[PDB]
Enzyme design. Structure first.
Site, mmCIF file in Angstrom:
data_model
loop_
_atom_site.group_PDB
_atom_site.id
_atom_site.type_symbol
_atom_site.label_atom_id
_atom_site.label_comp_id
_atom_site.label_asym_id
_atom_site.label_seq_id
_atom_site.Cartn_x
_atom_site.Cartn_y
_atom_site.Cartn_z
ATOM 1 N N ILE C 12 36.969 44.321 42.141
ATOM 2 C CA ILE C 12 38.162 45.086 41.789
ATOM 3 C C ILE C 12 38.981 45.398 43.033
ATOM 4 O O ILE C 12 40.205 45.237 43.041
ATOM 5 C CB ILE C 12 37.781 46.363 41.027
ATOM 6 N N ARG C 77 30.422 55.518 55.423
ATOM 7 C CA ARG C 77 29.650 55.762 54.211
ATOM 8 C C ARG C 77 30.067 57.045 53.512
ATOM 9 O O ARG C 77 29.963 57.135 52.284
ATOM 10 C CB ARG C 77 28.155 55.810 54.518
ATOM 11 N N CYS C 149 37.698 47.724 32.074
ATOM 12 C CA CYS C 149 38.496 46.613 31.567
ATOM 13 C C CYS C 149 38.421 46.519 30.046
ATOM 14 O O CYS C 149 39.442 46.318 29.379
ATOM 15 C CB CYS C 149 38.078 45.310 32.235
ATOM 16 N N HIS C 176 31.785 38.633 26.719
ATOM 17 C CA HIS C 176 32.185 39.118 28.028
ATOM 18 C C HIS C 176 31.691 38.164 29.101
ATOM 19 O O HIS C 176 30.547 37.699 29.058
ATOM 20 C CB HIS C 176 31.607 40.531 28.257
#
Ligand SMILES: OC[C@H]1O[C@H](O[C@H]2O[C@H](CO)[C@@H](O)[C@H](O)[C@H]2O)[C@H](O)[C@@H](O)[C@@H]1O
Ligand SMILES: OC[C@H]1O[C@H](O[C@H]2O[C@H](CO)[C@@H](O)[C@H](O)[C@H]2O)[C@H](O)[C@@H](O)[C@@H]1O
Ligand SMILES: OC[C@H]1O[C@H](O[C@H]2O[C@H](CO)[C@@H](O)[C@H](O)[C@H]2O)[C@H](O)[C@@H](O)[C@@H]1O
Ligand SMILES: OC[C@H]1O[C@H](O[C@H]2O[C@H](CO)[C@@H](O)[C@H](O)[C@H]2O)[C@H](O)[C@@H](O)[C@@H]1O
Ligand SMILES: O=P(O)(O)OC[C@H](O)CO
Ligand SMILES: O=P(O)(O)OC[C@H](O)CO
Ligand SMILES: O=P(O)(O)OC[C@H](O)CO
Ligand SMILES: O=P(O)(O)OC[C@H](O)CO
Ligand code: NA
Ligand code: NA
Lengths: 330, 330, 330, 330
Positions: C12, C77, C149, C176
């Site tokens: 993404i 982090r 999504c 999917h």
């Protein structure tokens, strides 16, 4: 511009059509196949491997209108009836796989075309040409062949290596994408039994067109090179794995430098060169017919090396079909 | 009966377990991994590549009952705490990939085992043994390595060819199934960038464990062979593509005869031989670690040839781990 | 121009980055992940699914130069140390999957950002917004989630159907694509056993994020819809298969007309509409988050129908992350 | 024993042949196809999906010798010339896909067979039978059809659900393995455009034979059920996703109990039942034509549920072809 008729709207015919859209020197004016125009339009518009067509596709009165230009659509089984002169065709891209001899391909000239380029290796002595290997040998013949995709990858690389270092002998493998001749599940393939086995399930040993063609486009290598293929479950892009013995000792850095020099000079746009961490999908859409993978190859010693070169077996070959059309029209 | 403890229940651990069920001389009595027993049972029962387990699997009191026999289940991170002596373990199949040196693997002996077989190439000078290459060099060592699957395919073939005809030099490729180190879609692999690219989409150049290991099990070939891999989108079974220059001239029929003789004689059950139109799935489940494909190979001339040999990288290797366990226990 | 920092350079994060290049209102100025800049550059440059990056990527002084613009690269982090204010970041695209609650995501605001968009469903009551379902309910919140999504495909379609005809109840399936959480061969997945099975070999039943999320962005449908997933061996693009019982009778042509009207009007660029013979690869790169497939669906009767809608689970969602960034910045 | 001739040696013909090897009640005595016997032997011996044939296959004098038994091989295009009586054939398994009407299939009876089972849905009013749905309606007809694999999965499950709870209306999807009608790369499929698109690359919406057949084998459900398919890139095994509204309220536990009771009683060997974490490869080789997946299904409420049932579209259907042969021979 050179006016081109495409005979056969399979993978090569359709990717030749798309490639010609991006070129100003060649205009497709007609397509012949046993497909309705609306189905041709669908096959052109949507492509699983190369995405949606970049442009507009209309069907009007049984013909295609592509980016506003009319493409004559016909469905003739006998090429002698194609009336290519009625649409001013200069060169026919003979892409059916069915007319790979002088006698069959010459029907296009009887039908009014001036020259024919076969999009596969000839089955008789029709001369084959590979850009970066022997286009400069073309001598005005009205029917020619562009060899095959694997020969278009192997020959430019073999020529650089031989010219610089002398190939004593070599053997090659192509690890090759699945193609339309294969089967989705184990099915009938009576002339090539392994080739009927389920393509998505298998590594499939096969014969390669390059074993017979490479010594024809580079006569100095005839009898010095042969090889074979493994078909694997990818939909496009293939790779040559060339194992050669060299007459002149050459370090792997010297080999890289010679290939890079050819890629940036004489063979620019044919031979490419990369040092990146590439994989096959990085060449989906590649126009160069042979992209040397510097980091993938390996030398045992200064006279025995394994060289790796990528090719988009659809896009590179189709673009060089157009290059051959332009070359024979000069 | 040789009592075996398995450390690590990944692909090799689980296929070693299945193969041990078919041997009367070896019995698995214990498995160690960071998996609950009910999850171990699920992974044993169902296998996407090899189908359902042939037998019964139950969980009782946190341990496995397989074909009615109790298998002790533990989840120790430190092998020194494995208490192998409490289940009478003779040999440990060390299958975690984490303990590939003498100092780490020897913790199993401190924990009560008598011997250890590493199911991967050692990272120090722990000796490797490959059936069909050098089992007869084994001389009492308590910690050994079975090399890797690709080495188990290449070495037996290289030995027959070298012994009969003399390998001057050779380069190999393995066209190799996807493995667990790969990624389903492009993802992080900072120590092997190509290996992070989506496995199902790509032909992926890689390195092979056989390039370092073959000269260790066949010292007469050290420095004479190296190679590389292409990972492709199949789930199991791989193929070695070996290109060799020969000291003694040999026609392809003479090479075939020599390989067949080894497959039918001394190397029976290790080297196989076929003349059939095989593809990779025809070796899913194959126990031979190197099956010579007579029709797939090709000779350029009597001293330069490409030889093709198949291997089930899970099953063949796992069976030869068990063979090595039996061999060192004699 | 809205300045955006990306936290997490997974699928993404990288496709959001590519999509931002085509928008003039949003500029990526910084990326944070535990990857060296040269490896980030490689992952951006080459994509197995979406092809080569359209632009230039260079590494200079440990940072990225993309299309000539400097992108600050960090490897923190703890998001509280991200110093977002030093690069003028307005909104953070929080794309690591690790900070899906107010308390964790708000560390970005402590680090100098003004707002955060989570690129996955929130794990607390952080509000979710889905374009074509409830963007107009946004009311100034500084931390929001773009859902998932599948929710971005289902919710716009469910809204048009419910608003026009009334969904009494519905059940859905998404077929999917494989994702990064899956395994290349059967491997450990102790919290989702089916999800550990080899992705390329299997149809894999799974749960979907849309079953919980749809009733949150469309409260009028809460308790009226749920569903599940099957993961299949494709690398990208998925399809929603929605079976609904309708309050008001509607013929399939009336349903088509209503969906087309929404796709051409209010929901243009979100909901798409096609009557073509499409397959999943025809939506690789699709920006609409829900493309209704008129010919694929089927009505049993005027109150019980199966509706089919496609989505590029990487591209559509990533573009709507950017839409949400713009929407909350108005 | 019932003597059977197989017409057509495609996937169904070959898996019927293998299934008949394991049954004592049926003996294959003859095969007809336009394949040489040595090629038939190869296709029988090696199977990408189901592995190597369990037995011996010899070719002698143009016929097959399988486990020592002679199988008459013929290559007749017109079934009226098959002389089935010369090998004592009782029933013909009509597996070419070409003779799905009474007039065409009856040529086998003219040629000396007593009865014909079509291995696909009839194209006229030839009656269809599905084990677990309507075998008990068979009334002595000399030509019958076994419907299709998807109908063999859907109908037994739909019957249990309807008999126990009353199906008001239902819609189904099958997520279906790739089959032989598909193409390896985008190719010509003029009667089913989506079905020509590259099978390994795509989720492909399609029509299912079950939508027209299920109301024929269960007349009480005619007009109450229909559906569609998505073809996906797996080589075998498919799954039914059935969304039904129930007249009688039933908890998901009550639904499980009814299915389990049918699987263990009346429909034993037809309907199976699992609560395990299964995926599609766990049914490669499955003989039950409908295996209910308890954990995969989901209920919205006591009257609206989504039920999941697996089927090996090759093995289950082929075994029930043999069951129908045995049934009509009683
Ligand atoms: O056509 C009959 C022959 O089929 C096979 O040989 C073909 O298929 C091979 C790949 O499986 C090719 O290498 C070969 O060139 C083809 O002729 C079979 O191997 C032969 O024995 C049959 O005669
Ligand atoms: O780890 C940083 C390096 O990553 C790459 O090199 C690794 O990955 C290669 C495959 O893509 C291997 O061949 C190589 O051995 C690995 O070290 C990258 O190519 C390097 O430039 C980086 O320094
Ligand atoms: O983590 C232990 C449990 O693992 C399985 O359940 C998980 O995996 C399933 C998919 O295979 C999911 O549906 C489920 O939600 C997960 O909890 C196993 O089925 C359980 O019996 C184990 O307790
Ligand atoms: O045969 C001409 C028609 O081709 C397509 O329709 C076929 O293909 C569809 C799948 O793509 C099927 O659903 C349909 O049943 C077939 O007839 C095209 O969609 C039609 O417009 C053409 O007339
Ligand atoms: O190598 P050739 O004969 O194809 O020649 C290629 C030309 O040098 C390019 O203009
Ligand atoms: O070649 P080696 O040393 O593995 O010996 C093998 C034995 O002769 C029988 O496999
Ligand atoms: O449905 P909403 O609330 O996302 O609103 C969408 C706008 O009308 C335009 O996309
Ligand atoms: O449901 P039917 O009619 O196929 O009958 C199956 C029988 O009960 C099994 O013997
Ligand atoms: Na790594
Ligand atoms: Na998990």
């Amino acid at each position: 511009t050179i006016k081109v008729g495409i005979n056969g709207f399979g993978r090569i015919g359709r990717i030749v059509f798309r490639a010609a859209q991006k070129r100003s020197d060649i205009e497709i004016v007609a397509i012949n196949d046993l497909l309705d125009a609306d189905y041709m339009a669908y096959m052109l518009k949507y492509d699983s491997t190369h995405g949606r067509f970049d442009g507009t596709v209309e069907v009007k009165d049984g013909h295609l209108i592509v980016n506003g230009k009319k493409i004559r659509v016909t469905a003739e089984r006998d090429p002698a009836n194609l009336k290519w002169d009625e649409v001013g065709v200069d060169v026919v891209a003979e892409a059916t796989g069915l007319f790979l001899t002088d006698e069959t391909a010459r029907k296009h000239i009887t039908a009014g075309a001036k020259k024919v380029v076969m999009t596969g290796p000839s089955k008789d002595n029709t001369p084959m040409f590979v850009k970066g290997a022997n286009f400069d040998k073309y001598a005005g013949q009205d029917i020619v062949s562009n060899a095959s995709c694997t020969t278009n990858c192997l020959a430019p690389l073999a020529k650089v290596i031989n010219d610089n270092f002398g190939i004593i002998e070599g053997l090659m493998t192509t690890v090759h994408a699945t193609t339309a001749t294969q089967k989705t599940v184990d099915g009938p393939s009576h002339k090539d039994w392994r080739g009927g086995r389920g393509a998505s399930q298998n590594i499939i040993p096969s014969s390669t067109g390059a074993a017979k063609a490479v010594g024809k486009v580079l006569p100095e290598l005839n009898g010095k090179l042969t090889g074979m293929a493994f078909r694997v479950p990818t939909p496009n892009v293939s790779v040559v794995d060339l194992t050669v013995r060299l007459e002149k000792a050459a370090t792997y850095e010297q080999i890289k430098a010679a290939v890079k020099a050819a890629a940036e000079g004489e063979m620019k746009g044919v031979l490419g060169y990369t040092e990146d961490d590439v994989v096959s999908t990085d060449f989906n859409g590649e126009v160069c017919t042979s992209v040397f993978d510097a980091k993938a190859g390996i030398a045992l010693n200064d006279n025995f090396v394994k060289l790796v070169s990528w090719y988009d077996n659809e896009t590179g070959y189709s673009n060089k079909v157009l290059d051959l059309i332009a070359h024979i029209s000069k």
